[PDB]
Structure 1
Amino acid sequence: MQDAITSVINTYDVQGKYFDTSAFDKLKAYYATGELRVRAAGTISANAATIIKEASAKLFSNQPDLVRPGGNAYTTRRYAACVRDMDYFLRYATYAMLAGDTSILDERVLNGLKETYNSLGVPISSTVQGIQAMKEVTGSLVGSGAAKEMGVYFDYLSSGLS
């Protein structure tokens, strides 16, 4: 759970050195992208309900068998669990986008999730497809400049689950 600022602080503290000019430039980049990051996070917080709506609808449209009996989501319990998983994934992707670093995904999302799904038998392919469904839509609402930023975090979640 570290942002870009804390990331450079740690990478410079571990070696015991003071900040360099390159460090200041890398800080400048994040300070410049901060406003668009905040705007994207605000739009995402605005529309999170809608992206959940459409993500669940599209996931259960392209794969029919989940909602039908015998499916990985066949129950109101399992349906709520799946939509809650999308909600948490999207909120944490927004968190990572604000922080500008993927450490939060490791330390609160991928921390024990992968082997939890392995023991539960959750299909990794369906989860990854849900993540593409979420990001391809969220990119439209957040704009292309914020879309490319959300893309790396959603892809990181996919690769972690994959």
Structure 2
Amino acid sequence: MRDAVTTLIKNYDLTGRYLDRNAMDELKAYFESGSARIAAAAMINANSATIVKRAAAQLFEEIPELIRPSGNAYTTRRFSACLRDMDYYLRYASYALIAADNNVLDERVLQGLRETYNSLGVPIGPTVRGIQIMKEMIEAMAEDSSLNSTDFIASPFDHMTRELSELSV
């Protein structure tokens, strides 16, 4: 995996350049954001399980059929597996928030998601809907909390949405 600093370093090493003023500026921006990154990660760690439970309790009301017959969370086994996927999404989103880069997100989440979910027959739309529900809950809780900077939180979840979402248009 690569965080923002490592991805910048790799980008500059690609051209074989020394770290210039723009590199220093990007590094300074990340290093100043690091306080809010750690704060948001601590908050999401504090409220993790509750966040995923509430996100599922909203998503199964948005699309009720995932718990009715022929739905993909019908059994308690399927329900627990779905909640496990949601917890995985939250944990890797937290890792990506701390790292300030979505490559750790890609290498360990998205790179085969459609293949695995298609093989298991899991829908690929409700999952991103639940992802966005988690992101909304996370950002609402952050806004309620004393987090001066919270814009970066939408980046990991939105990248997950863009990658794992079917290209509708």
Question: TM-score per shorter chain, which class?
Answer: over 0.9
**CA distance in structure 1 between the partners assigned to 2:61 and 2:133 by the alignment:** 11
Aligned equivalent of 2:83? 83
What secondary structure, in the 3-state scheme, does the structure 2 residue paired with 1:112 have?
helix
**CA distance in structure 1 between the partners assigned to 2:148 and 2:58 by the alignment:** 24
**CA distance in structure 2 between the partners assigned to 1:122 and 1:161 by the alignment:** 12
Per-residue CA distance 1:42-76 (angstroms, 9 max, x = gap): 00000001101201111111221111222111111
Structure 2: gaps spanning 5 or more residues: none
Aligned equivalent of 1:115? 115
Deviation (angstroms), 1:112:
1.5
Q: CA RMSD in A?
A: 1.3
Aligned equivalent of 2:138? 138
8 Å contact kept, 2:36–2:150 = no
Aligned equivalent of 1:8? 8
Q: Does 1:158 align with 2:148?
A: no
Deviates more, 1:32-41 or 1:105-114: 105-114
Deviation (angstroms), 1:148:
2.2
**CA distance in structure 1 between the partners assigned to 2:113 and 2:138 by the alignment:** 23
Amino acid aligned to 1:6: T
**CA distance in structure 1 between the partners assigned to 2:53 and 2:36 by the alignment:** 25
Matched residue count: 162
Deviation (angstroms), 1:121:
2.2
Provide the TM-score with structure 2 as the length reference.
Answer: 0.91
Deviation (angstroms), 1:113:
1.5
Moved over 6 A (4+): none
Deviates more, 1:76-85 or 1:137-146: 137-146
Provide the TM-score with structure 1 as the length reference.
Answer: 0.95
Aligned equivalent of 1:51? 51
8 Å contact kept, 2:2–2:103 = yes
The percent of aligned pairs where both chains have the same amino acid is: 54
Structure 1: gaps spanning 5 or more residues: none
Deviation (angstroms), 1:116:
1.0
Aligned equivalent of 2:20? 20
